[PDB]
Design a protein around this nucleic acid. Structure first.
Lengths: 149, 77, 272, 46
RNA sequence: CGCGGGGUGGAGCAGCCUGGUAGCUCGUCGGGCUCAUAACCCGAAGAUCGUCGGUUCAAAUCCGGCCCCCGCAACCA
RNA sequence: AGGACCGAACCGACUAAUGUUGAAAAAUUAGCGGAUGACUUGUGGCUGGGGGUGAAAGGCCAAUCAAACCGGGAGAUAGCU
RNA sequence: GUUUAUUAAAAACACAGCACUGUGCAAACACGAAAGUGGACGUAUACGGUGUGACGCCUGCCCGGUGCCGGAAGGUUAAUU
RNA sequence: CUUUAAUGUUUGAUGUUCUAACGUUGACCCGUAAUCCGGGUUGCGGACAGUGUCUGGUGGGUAGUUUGACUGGGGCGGUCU
């Protein structure tokens, strides 16, 4: 494995890689977010020539994970439109896995697919506590507010 | 499949001769990580079958050329 | 109900059958009944692979529900039936949200009672609820492996897998064999046990009955040959080792998991 | 004691056909080897 | 299959480490005691110290084989 | 009523007399047992040789089974006849 | 009930019950390169496999060795740095 | 030098932990009024089951081979200079 690694959160703390690696952070985290550069070792000297022009542009393309860590561990009051079955509960023949899913036909794509639940979420309209991925390595409580849909 | 989509491969001929010194066939295989990669201008995942050491080829060449040859072929379901 | 026989024929002397109050003539219409393609042990490759299963009278029995997840509305009942492969009774159930199915009986169900699927309101019995709100001292049936699947464990006449912790992101439950598993706390299950707990008074006593329930008779290993049981064949019934399975392992032991994904939830095991 | 051969040619035709057999490699190798030999039939099944 | 601690008169112990020195309790035999049996006490024989060899002026003890308990090797590109 | 019984057609074959270079690669006559049941069974379908399949005898795979067949390796090899 | 078709029809084999164990379901298990499908759409009162064989009375002593289950204080140990 | 904390620094191990790889006979819409298949979303396990390479334990379940002459024929026995 020989790549040019380009991220500035979670565990990476370089804006280049010029030698080989025992760990593929490429095709793992950085290629799911369009924020890596490829290498043949034919071009690493060249990359470091190109970097003086490039890096101030490139620094924002490697800001996609930064975004997520920054804007969600902040204190937040998340407004969610949610729906209630006929027993008045948001859980009649719904349960946990439909009370979240809604992006099925309309919207754009979203960065989420798992959250361990140490509490019950999305219970009824009002405030409730929701313990979540403030970043994809870092678990901490956000506040939710549920409104009618 | 053991055929990677960035290099041609075969499971090769393979014997012991290393714990009884008598050459009896056991055969050798690749791994075949049936492995997803991402396409950002389509906001989706597409899948390329790589083997062990064959992933290391994709890393050293560039994913993008391989990823473009599947687009050049069309995705089919 | 059960019907137990006295000595009044050979082959009748001890035999027991489960009957019901609400009876029906023949096969019932097709909106509740569907060709289940039953194969008596035979697979997609043309071979009997499940051994000493099958034979006897044909089956085509309904698929039933085990998902049980409901909008909380009352229901009517039409007739109560016993199943030919499940060991419990199954109601024909007509929920007032217009639904029509067969459903497995919980701790209670009747012709004027509902099932919930609510998170904090299905807290009563016989109503399907997430496992957070069920005690460390309360039985449970309907236990589903991941949230929304519907139960796979404790689905038989009087069977339960009772909760022994509920604290943290998992629920800890004890198994009717000696094993202990975690199940995530947001999976749905139901307070109590399955109906027809009285099944255990079915003693049987006619061998043709397991033949038509699609279970074939199985033979002594010492009358098998050594490829089907290695402690077998020869003259005058051999002993001087213990009995054996033909999978290259014993029969009084050797733990086995071919696919090992079953062990990822199992945090403790059966002992001897 | 009991009949040791059945008369029904149905079970012969769908065992040993042409079309159903060409599709598979090893049945195609029948049709090849028989044809090259020079026989007035390749299937004995119509 | 190697390195070290342990392996007691017919039975069970004390002694045990550069070590020799056989001593206590039972069964036995003489004595003592009880009206007598009894256990219990004194004395005496028994000593193959797991079994074989080796080192040492001296081996139960230290050293090497083996069988048995325990600590370690339980594995090698 | 009955995996009760006696019993045809329908299915089987414990015994007995015979057959034994036969009428017939177990059948006959006659006693005999299942026949409302784990029975009898037509059509269509399916697994191919140390592999199936077996209420198990190490049974059954084209009146054959304790090991079905052919085209090639092949002039297999035989301290051998 | 089943029984070596065309030798045994039984004193062998089967069964409910009884003990033992694997298996928590995408099951153990079977077969197939594996996807896969049967098991079962049933799910430990269920399913595989073991010895024993409805029913009344029962099964005393004990793991030397054999395979297997499980637990713990902890020394090292392939592979590898 | 040794042990060794703080900690700079490369690599091996660990505890607790996440979803972001990977799985998904979890679930909902969608191609598609296709039980396939795939992606989207979202539930759940998870850097693990998995599988290759290596390698240690177990294992005739399975397959290819191997298992004396001499000798008053001689099994076994005894003997082989």
């Amino acid at each position: 494995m020989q790549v040019i690694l380009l991220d500035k959160v979670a565990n990476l703390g370089s804006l280049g890689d010029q030698v080989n690696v025992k760990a593929g952070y490429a095709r793992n985290f950085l290629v799911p977010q369009g924020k890596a550069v490829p290498a043949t070792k034919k071009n690493i000297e060249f990359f470091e020539a190109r970097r003086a022009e490039l890096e101030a542009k490139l620094a924002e393309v490697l800001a996609a994970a930064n975004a997520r860590a920054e804007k969600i561990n902040a204190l937040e009051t998340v407004t969610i439109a949610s729906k209630a079955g006929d027993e008045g509960k948001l859980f009649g023949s719904i349960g946990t896995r439909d009370i979240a899913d809604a992006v099925t036909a309309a919207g754009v794509e979203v960065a989420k697919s798992e959250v361990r639940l140490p509490n019950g979420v999305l219970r009824t309209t009002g405030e409730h506590e929701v313990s979540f991925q403030v970043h994809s390595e870092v678990f901490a409580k956000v506040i939710v507010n549920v409104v009618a849909e | 499949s053991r055929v990677c989509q960035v290099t041609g491969k075969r499971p090769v001929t393979g014997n012991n001769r290393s714990h009884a010194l008598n050459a009896t066939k056991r055969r050798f295989l690749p791994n075949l990580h049936s492995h997803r990669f991402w396409v950002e201008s389509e906001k989706r995942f597409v899948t390329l079958r790589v083997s062990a050491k064959g992933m290391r080829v994709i890393d050293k060449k560039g994913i993008d050329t391989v990823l473009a040859e599947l687009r050049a072929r069309g995705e089919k379901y | 109900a059960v019907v137990k026989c006295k000595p009044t024929s050979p082959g009748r002397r001890h035999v027991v059958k489960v009957v019901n109050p609400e009876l029906h003539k023949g096969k019932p219409f097709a909106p509740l009944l569907e060709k289940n393609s039953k194969s008596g042990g035979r697979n997609n490759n043309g071979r009997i692979t499940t051994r000493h299963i099958g034979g006897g009278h044909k089956q085509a029995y309904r698929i039933v529900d085990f998902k049980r997840n409901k909008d909380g509305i009352p229901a009517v009942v039409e007739r109560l039936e016993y199943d030919p492969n499940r060991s419990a009774n199954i109601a024909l159930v007509l929920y007032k949200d217009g639904e029509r199915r067969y459903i497995l009986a919980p701790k209670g169900l009747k012709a004027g009672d509902q099932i919930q699927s609510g998170v904090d309101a299905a807290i009563k019995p016989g109503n399907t609820l997430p496992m957070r709100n069920i005690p460390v001292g309360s039985t449970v049936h309907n236990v589903e492996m991941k949230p929304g699947k519907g139960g796979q464990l404790a689905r038989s006449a009087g069977t339960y897998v009772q909760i022994v912790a509920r604290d943290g992101a998992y629920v800890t439950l004890r198994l009717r064999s000696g094993e202990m598993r975690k199940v995530e706390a947001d999976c749905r299950a139901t307070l109590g046990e399955v109906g027809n707990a009285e099944h255990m008074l079915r003693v049987l006593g006619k061998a043709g009955a397991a033949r038509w329930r699609g279970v074939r008779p199985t033979v002594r290993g010492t009358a098998m040959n050594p490829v089907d049981h290695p402690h077998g064949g020869g003259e005058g019934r051999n002993f001087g080792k213990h009995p054996v399975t033909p999978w290259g392992v014993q029969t009084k032991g050797k733990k086995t998991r071919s696919n090992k994904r079953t062990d990822k939830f199992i945090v403790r095991r059966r002992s001897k | 004691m009991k009949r040791t051969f059945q008369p029904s040619v149905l079970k012969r035709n769908r065992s040993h056909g042409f079309r159903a057999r060409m599709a598979t490699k090893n049945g195609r190798q029948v049709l090849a080897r028989r044809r090259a030999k020079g026989r007035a039939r390749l299937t004995v099944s119509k």
